[PDB]
Amino acid sequence: GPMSKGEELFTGVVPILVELDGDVNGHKFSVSGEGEGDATYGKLTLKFICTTGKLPVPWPTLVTTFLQCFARYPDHMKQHDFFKSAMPEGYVQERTIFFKDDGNYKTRAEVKFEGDTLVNRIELKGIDFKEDGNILGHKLEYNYNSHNVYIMADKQKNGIKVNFKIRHNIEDGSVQLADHYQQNTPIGDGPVLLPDNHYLSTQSALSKDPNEKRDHMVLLEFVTAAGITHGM
């Protein structure tokens, strides 16, 4: 049987909405996204448009901010799926992202069902970025590397936490590190699944829509959980 009510909400393809309100170094911007997720296969397909004009930061720097409830949790790990267990009421996802030798993003998001759509609504604030740096200078290549992140329960606050470093390729062959600190809290009061320590493995591909004039990003992702019981 299912390990949570929310688990049952992801057995098929689910429509997704993303809305982001951003302010980086005083530049306000808005992004809207639409797409589909299929947690049976850990897959996400999304398209994002900057509705205020040109995006003042590089698209790759917002990938982690723009849905871990769509991770594929294999059968022997469904008891560790916090993200679906918080649904439908959802969870708050808070981060600070520290860009090495540059500014920081602070983000607060709510991920929940609204009607039949899984919706991620984000407030992002960035400060202390260098005008001529990798971020405001758009020096990041339009690609994305794979990353494995270590999920841990936050027993006292009834949620999960994770730290991880994103490596962004720069146009000169160097890397821009984006150090992520993340805290997830249920929105509702019902029971949730607090996981054993485990990994989420994510692969991401960035592309463009040939028919899209606006500044935009097409994002395809594969996310799967991997346990470390090592029963051998």
Write the DSSP assignment of 52-103 as a string of letters. TSS-SS-GGGGTTT--GGGSB--GGGGGG-HHHHTTTT-EEEEEEEEETTS-
In angstroms, rounded to a whole number, what is the distance separating the alpha carbons of residues 181 and 144?
Answer: 19
Beta strands at 117-127 and 175-186: parallel, antiparallel or unpaired? unpaired
Pull the structure tokens for residue 65.
Answer: 């901010």
Beta carbons within 8 Å of 214's beta carbon, 6+ residues apart = 49, 50, 51
In angstroms, rounded to a whole number, what is the distance separating the alpha carbons of residues 154 and 24?
Answer: 30
Beta strands at 198-207 and 147-154: parallel, antiparallel or unpaired? antiparallel
Q: Are 177 and 100 in contact (CB under 8 A)?
A: yes
Which of 175, 180, 177, 146 lies closest to 162 in space, CA to CA? 180
In angstroms, rounded to a whole number, what is the distance separating the alpha carbons of residues 165 and 195?
Answer: 21
Which of 91, 87, 110, 77 lies closest to 195 in space, CA to CA? 77
CATH number for 1-232 (one of 2.40.170.20, 2.30.30.40, 2.40.155.10, 2.130.10.10): it is: 2.40.155.10
Residue 194 is classified by DSSP as P
In angstroms, rounded to a whole number, what is the distance separating the alpha carbons of residues 136 and 30?
Answer: 16
Q: Which residues pair with 113 in a beta bridge?
A: 118
Cα dihedral 168, 213, 29, 95 in deg (nearest 10): -30
Q: Are 207 and 220 in contact (CB under 8 A)?
A: yes
Query: Hey, how many other C-beta atoms are within 10 angstroms of the C-beta on 222?
Result: 17
In angstroms, rounded to a whole number, what is the distance separating the alpha carbons of residues 47 and 206?
Answer: 10
How many CA atoms does the CB half-sphere of 199 hold within 13 Å?
Answer: 10
Which of 189, 195, 225 lies closest to 91 in space, CA to CA? 189
Q: Are 199 and 148 in contact (CB under 8 A)?
A: yes
Q: Are 83 and 71 in contact (CB under 8 A)?
A: yes
In angstroms, rounded to a whole number, what is the distance separating the alpha carbons of residues 40 and 61?
Answer: 27
Radius of gyration (Cα) for the chain, nearest Å?
17
Beta strands at 14-24 and 104-114: parallel, antiparallel or unpaired? unpaired
Which of 80, 115, 110 lies closest to 7 in space, CA to CA? 80
In angstroms, rounded to a whole number, what is the distance separating the alpha carbons of residues 85 and 87?
Answer: 5
Measured distance between the N- and C-terminal CA atoms of the chain, rounded to whole angstroms: 26
Which of 224, 166, 225, 223 lies closest to 196 in space, CA to CA? 225
Q: Which residues pair with 226 in a beta bridge?
A: 199
CA 100 to chain centre: 20
Query: Hey, how many other C-beta atoms are within 10 angstroms of the C-beta on 177?
Result: 13
Beta strands at 117-127 and 43-50: parallel, antiparallel or unpaired? unpaired
| Residue type (1 letter), 78 | K
In angstroms, rounded to a whole number, what is the distance separating the alpha carbons of residues 30 and 104?
Answer: 18
Residue 4 is classified by DSSP as S
Beta carbons within 8 Å of 179's beta carbon, 6+ residues apart = 97, 98, 99, 100, 163, 165
Beta carbons within 8 Å of 101's beta carbon, 6+ residues apart = 130, 133
Resolution number, Å: 1.6
Pull the structure tokens for residue 145.
Answer: 């590397």
Write the DSSP string, 128-175.
S--TTSTTTTT-B-S----EEEEEEEETTTTEEEEEEEEEEEBTTS-E
